[PDB]
Structure formats: structure tokens, C-alpha cells
Write a protein that binds this ligand. Structure first.
Ligand SMILES: OC[C@H]1O[C@@H](O[C@H]2[C@H](O)[C@@H](O)[C@H](O[C@H]3[C@H](O)[C@@H](O)[C@H](O[C@H]4[C@H](O)[C@@H](O)[C@H](O[C@H]5[C@H](O)[C@@H](O)[C@H](O[C@H]6[C@H](O)[C@@H](O)[C@H](O)O[C@@H]6CO)O[C@@H]5CO)O[C@@H]4CO)O[C@@H]3CO)O[C@@H]2CO)[C@H](O)[C@@H](O)[C@@H]1O
Length: 642
């Protein structure tokens, strides 16, 4: 576990970042795959939260990988890493032409076939309804195609890097997916499956009839993006471009800038209702134009087609979470010459989008200052009428916990830092005035909740509890006196601490550039967080920083039942039997050979939470980048033991 950093007082944040960078990139540490250089979720394999295995990769991890190299370039002058990062990304996690066969057959007038979402995984599979549901049109596909070709240039969210699930050939990296079955399907209640479905495993129809009930079943591929990964990546490329041109080295990143621009154009797919229904309809009214556009970054876009015969479909998402917005990236593609969309309409849509997102944050801001969850255009996932007294935002209903309820998707304080960091960069770069009150109220709140201790430790909010509703959006912030957030627990999360330090340093930099004076308190708090995360969680084996966490939730390894429909039967690539009655561990039987299996299992027997040490990729990067931000805007600042 953790031991104190030996670091000398007066070490520059530049030098600290260079130390952490070195450790993240050292092949002996094992942050990246040995064969292809893909960044794993974490060094440890036994870990369950969003991904359910440590040696998956996620598009998230890649976005952080790009961010890290951007900062490296800034501090160092060597830009090759940014190119390498983006190469690995397109070689592996972006589906190429050969992996989206006959996407060319996609029809904008009939994007997809409607299906309900339900409040429990037991209700699934969900029935596809070519019957009685007319679906809206896709107003974006044509001008995307016209600029780019038939294919989708987005990152699929999840990939099994060393094929630990077995769905793939030999040891190759394989697209996989998990979440399918509505709001009550946590990480613990899923059935992992390949994205390219060849019936090679599972039941007779592979895994399909587990999730979506069709009249007939055929071999198909499907993908899902998590747009916050794309936002982060393009955001990183903006900085890579800016910093590189300052050095007279813009040519080293021009191709990546171009790819990032394209990527940004495609994120437009994330702006529409799941089935292109009218925003605010409270009904399954198909939409014709941009009437289906909420103009926010929804939870996903997903698309697929047949492997055999050629056909295709695409969905947006009706659900929107504040934690997924990126008004900064929005603003980059809307206004910045080098990131101008090739499409004829992208610049205009993005211009609408970023402003629209900036209003979202404002609408969601509780009376205390933290940002509430979000909003939906399809109540209970089936476009029902909104309950009486439901406050709205351009027609969408307020939801405290968009998409997931176990745990509620806005319980995690991490989103506050992640999401408002972007708003800070936006204020840094525009001096936009309309956003000043949002930012200050949020900073005030966060400053009131950070705990510093005289022994040099720290604590930050971990879990949030929400009550009430925002007032209905009128174009203007009311103060939401009846929307409340309460911090219910605190911890020592290293990525979240890095992320929040970034936000405070960036904000501080922004007050210097645009306001009467530098916000000295925000700047100093950024430095405290970084000092304390590094001093207190240093890894003496040289792997960077390292967490120590009681994972009570790990009892679900052995206690959680995974719904399988009665009568359904099938097998994982290693024989593990998929049938009604199974627990998490039953379909992930290889876990028993994990170095940390004994430890978590013995803690199960004795009825106690096991204690884990984790080096997550993104924890290390969020901390490193925070250091790099201090190095960039406050180059005289200098580490000291806290
Ligand atoms: O016409 C010719 C042939 O057509 C066939 O019929 C087609 C039909 O035309 C077409 O409409 C249909 O497409 C549907 C698919 O069947 C179905 O798979 C798809 O389901 C979606 C589902 O609606 C959606 O909610 C779900 O989203 C998941 C997502 O996959 C998952 O990745 C995501 O996880 C996120 C985590 O929550 C988050 O924490 C993490 O950070 O990021 C992740 C997001 O990146 O969670 C979401 C939900 O929360 O995805 C699935 C797809 O994966 O819906 C389509 C339309 O309804 O396909 C049919 C074929 O199957 C006929 O079969 C044939 O006869 C004809 O010849």
C-alpha cells in the first residue's frame, strides 16, 4: 500500500509531473499492454466498478492517455507521444471500415427499431417493435457521410485487451460490452458479451435473446460510445495544438488535430433522442428535423449492423448527465479554425451545442453550489408523461440520477470535478461572463467541503445526496432555493483529488487573466490537494501513487444473482454455465486464479470488507495533469511536504 513521498521540498511541479509521467510510461510498471501499448483500466486485474475486470481498456483510459502526452509535450518539447497515443487509439479502439460491414446500408429515415427500457433486469429481453412505433429521422447522417464516408469515427467504450473473457481468437484484443438491461443493472448484474456476435458462444442465438427479443436472430456487430471520453480527447488535442504552436512545433500534431476534428463532428450523434423523438413530446412523436436534438452529450450513441446480409441501425440517447457535458470541447469545434468540422453543418450545430450545455450546468446548480444530475426526454425509458410538478429544461424532465440508480449515477462526487474542470477551461479561454456566477458558486461550495488536516492528510467529498428540483429553466438562473446537495461521506480518492486540483488551478489562472485580481485561495488549494495526494499515497515500489480502499461492495462477487430468463441456457468460452441462479463469479470463473481472489474471498467468509491497493490508469493521469497545470500557469510554485 501507500507510504510517504521522500520528495525534497522545492521540487517544481514540472519535475513532479515528469517523475509521475516516467512511472506511468515505464514498461516494467505494467500500465499498458505489452504487445500493443493499450492502456489498461488498472495494473490490478481484480477490480469491479464501471468495467468489471482490470485488464479491459476503456475509451476513457485512452482519452487520459492522450491528455498525458499533451501535457508531456508542453513541458518537454517532445510531441511524438501524442501521435503514438492517437495511433494506438485508431489501431484498436475505433472500429475501422472492416469492423462496421455494410454501415453504408444505414437509413436516415428509419434509423432504428424502437424498444422499451424497463426498471429491472428481470423484464429483459426487451421486445423490438416494428409494429406500432414510428421512429424519427436522422438529420445529421447525410452531411457526416458527405464529408467522411459511410463509417462512424467514434471510440467503442470497452475492449478486452488480452481476451480474458475468451470471446476472441487466441489472445487478441476483442470488443465486448456489458450493460444492456436498464437502470437497475449495475456492474454486478451484467452478462459480458462480444460486440461482434458470431454465435460462437453463449446460447443458440449467442447472447442476443438475453437482451433484445426479435422475431428472428442473425449474426451482427454493435458498438457504443461514451462521449465524455471523446470530449476529453479533443479537449486534450486543443491543448496539444496550442502548446505545440507556442514552441513552433505545430506540424508534430497537425494530423492528430485533423482526426480530433473529425471525431468532434461525429459526437453530434450524441446530441439526439434515442429514437429521434421530438424533444419535450412526452410521447413517441417522431421528429423530422433538428426537433429531436437536445444538443447535450447524452449517455451514449450506439450503432450496428448485420454480419451476413447488409443492414444497419443507429441510436442516440434520451438521457443526459451533467457529468458528461464538455462545453469546452463544444467550443473548440464550434469556433477554432484548426478544429473546424469538414461537414457543412457541424460548426453551426456545435455553436448551438456548447451554449446549450453551458445553460444545462446553470439550470442544474443546487442552492449550495454542486451540480445536480440531469434530464431525460424519455421518462422511465418509455417516453411516458412526466409526473405532475416536474421541472423541465427545454422540454426535458429533471432526473437526479440519469440512467442508473444502483448506485444513483449522481452520488459520485467525481463528476463534479471532471465536469466543472471543462467549464473552467472554457472560462480560461473565453472570459465568458455569463458563466462567472456558476463557476464562483461551485468553487465556494467545493472550498467549503475540502478538509485539510494539520497532519498533512486531506479528505474530499465522496458521496452526495440530493433532494428537491431545480426551478424550470427560463433562460436565467433562479438560485434553485429548493434544490439541495448534502455530502454524506468523504475519502481520499486520488483521481478525483487530481481532477479537482486541476479545476481549482485552472479557475485561478482564469481569474488572473480576466478579473481584477488572482484568486489566491483557489490556487493554494490546488497546490494543497496535489501536495497531499502525492505525499500521502506515494508508491515506494516506483509505480506512482497508490490507493488504499475498503471495498465492502466486493461481497457481491459471491452474493449477487445475475438474472437469466427461465429456460435460457448457454456457456462462456471456458465452460462456465450461463443459467438461472448464477452469481457474478459463476460466469467469471477465471477470477478464482487471480492473485487477489483468496484475499477477497477470505474477507467474504469472515464477513468483512477486503482492503485493496489500486493503481488505476486515470487516477495517475488526473494527478499528473494537475501537476502539469500548476507547472503551466504557476511556474514558480513548488512542492513542499504538507
Ligand atoms: O432490417 C434488416 C434486419 O433488421 C434486423 O433488426 C434489427 C433492427 O433493424 C435494429 O433496429 C436493431 O437495433 C437494436 C438492437 O437490437 C439492440 O441491440 C439495441 O439495444 C441497445 C439498447 O437500446 C441501449 O439501451 C444499449 O445501451 C447500453 C450500451 O450498449 C452500453 O454500452 C452502455 O454502457 C455504458 C455504461 O452505462 C457507462 O457507465 C460507461 O461509462 O459507458 C457505456 C456507454 O458507452 O449502456 C447503455 C444503456 O445504459 O445498447 C444496446 C446495444 O448495445 O437497440 C437497437 C435499436 O433498438 O437491431 C436489429 C437486429 O438485432 C432483423 O433482426 C432482421 O430480420 C432484418 O433482416
Amino acid at each position: 500500500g501507500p507510504t510517504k513521498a521522500p520528495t525534497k521540498d522545492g521540487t517544481s511541479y514540472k519535475d513532479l509531473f515528469l517523475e509521475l509521467y516516467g512511472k506511468i510510461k515505464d514498461p516494467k510498471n505494467g500500465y499498458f499492454s505489452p504487445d500493443e501499448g493499450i492502456p489498461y483500466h488498472s495494473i490490478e486485474t481484480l477490480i469491479v466498478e464501471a468495467p468489471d475486470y482490470g485488464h479491459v481498456t476503456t475509451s476513457e483510459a485512452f482519452s487520459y492517455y492522450v491528455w498525458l502526452e499533451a501535457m508531456y509535450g508542453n513541458l518537454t518539447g517532445n510531441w511524438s507521444g501524442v501521435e503514438t497515443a492517437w495511433k494506438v487509439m485508431e489501431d484498436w479502439i475505433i472500429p475501422d471500415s472492416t469492423e462496421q460491414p455494410g454501415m453504408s446500408s444505414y437509413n436516415p429515415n428509419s434509423p432504428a427499431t424502437y424498444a422499451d427500457e424497463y426498471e429491472d433486469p428481470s423484464y429483459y429481453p426487451s421486445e423490438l417493435k416494428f409494429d406500432t412505433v414510428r421512429v424519427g429521422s436522422d438529420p445529421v447522417h447525410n452531411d457526416l457521410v458527405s464529408a467522411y464516408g459511410p463509417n462512424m469515427y467514434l471510440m467503442h467504450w470497452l475492449m478486452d485487451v488480452d481476451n480474458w473473457y475468451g470471446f476472441g481468437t487466441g489472445t487478441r484484443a476483442t470488443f465486448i460490452n456489458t450493460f444492456q438491461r436498464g437502470e437497475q443493472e449495475s456492474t454486478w448484474e451484467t452478462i459480458p458479451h462480444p460486440s461482434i456476435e458470431e454465435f460462437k458462444y453463449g446460447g443458440p442465438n449467442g447472447f442476443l435473446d438475453l437482451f433484445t427479443k426479435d422475431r428472428s436472430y442473425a449474426k451482427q456487430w454493435r458498438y457504443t460510445n461514451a462521449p465524455d471520453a471523446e470530449g476529453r480527447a479533443i479537449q486534450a488535442v486543443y491543448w496539444a495544438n496550442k502548446w505545440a504552436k507556442e514552441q513552433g512545433k505545430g506540424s508534430a500534431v497537425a494530423s492528430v488535430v485533423s482526426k480530433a476534428a473529425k471525431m468532434g463532428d461525429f459526437l453530434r450523434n450524441d446530441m439526439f433522442d434515442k429514437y429521434f423523438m421530438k424533444i419535450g413530446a412526452q410521447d413517441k412523436t417522431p421528429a423530422t428535423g433538428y426537433d429531436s436534438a437536445h444538443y447535450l452529450m447524452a449517455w451514449y450513441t450506439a450503432w450496428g449492423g448485420g454480419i451476413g446480409a447488409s443492414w444497419a441501425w443507429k441510436i442516440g440517447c434520451s438521457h443526459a448527465h451533467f457529468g458528461y457535458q464538455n462545453p469546452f470541447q463544444g467550443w473548440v469545434s464550434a469556433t477554432q479554425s484548426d478544429f473546424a468540422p469538414k461537414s457543412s453543418n457541424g460548426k453551426r450545430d456545435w455553436t448551438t451545442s456548447y451554449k446549450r450545455q453551458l445553460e444545462f450546468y446553470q439550470w442544474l446548480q443546487s442552492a449550495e453550489g454542486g451540480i445536480a444530475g440531469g434530464a431525460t426526454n424519455s421518462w422511465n425509458g418509455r417516453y411516458e408523461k412526466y409526473p405532475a410538478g416536474t421541472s423541465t429544461f427545454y422540454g426535458m424532465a429533471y432526473v437526479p440520477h440519469p440512467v442508473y440508480a444502483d448506485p444513483g449515477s449522481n452520488q459520485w462526487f467525481g463528476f463534479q470535478a471532471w465536469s466543472m474542470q471543462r467549464v473552467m477551461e472554457y472560462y480560461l479561454e473565453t472570459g465568458d461572463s455569463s458563466v462567472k456566477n456558476l463557476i464562483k458558486k461551485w468553487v465556494d461550495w467545493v472550498m467549503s467541503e475540502i478538509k485539510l488536516y494539520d497532519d498533512g492528510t486531506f479528505a474530499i467529498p465522496s458521496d452526495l445526496e440530493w433532494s428537491g428540483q431545480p426551478d424550470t429553466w427560463t433562460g436565467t438562473y433562479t438560485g434553485n432555493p429548493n434544490l439541495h446537495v448534502r455530502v454524506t461521506s468523504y475519502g481520499t480518492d486520488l483521481g478525483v483529488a487530481g481532477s479537482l486540483a486541476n479545476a481549482l488551478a485552472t479557475y485561478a489562472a482564469a481569474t488572473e487573466r480576466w478579473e481584477g485580481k488572482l484568486d489566491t485561495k483557489a490556487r493554494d488549494m490546488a497546490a494543497e490537494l496535489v501536495n497531499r495526494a502525492w505525499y500521502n499515497f506515494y508508491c515506494s515500489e516506483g509505480k506512482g501513487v497508490v490507493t488504499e480502499e475498503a471495498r465492502a461492495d466486493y461481497k457481491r462477487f459471491f452474493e449477487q444473482e445475475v438474472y437469466v430468463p427461465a429456460g435460457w441456457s448457454g456457456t462462456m468460452p471456458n465452460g462456465d454455465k450461463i443459467q438461472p441462479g448464477i452469481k457474478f463469479i459463476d460466469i467469471r470463473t477465471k477470477y478464482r486464479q487471480d492473485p487477489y481472489y483468496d484475499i477477497v474471498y477470505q474477507a467474504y467468509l469472515r464477513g468483512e470488507a477486503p482492503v485493496l491497493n489500486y493503481h488505476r490508469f486515470w487516477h495517475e493521469v488526473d494527478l499528473a495533469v494537475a501537476m502539469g497545470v500548476l507547472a503551466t500557469y504557476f511556474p514558480d510554485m513548488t512542492y513542499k511536504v504538507p
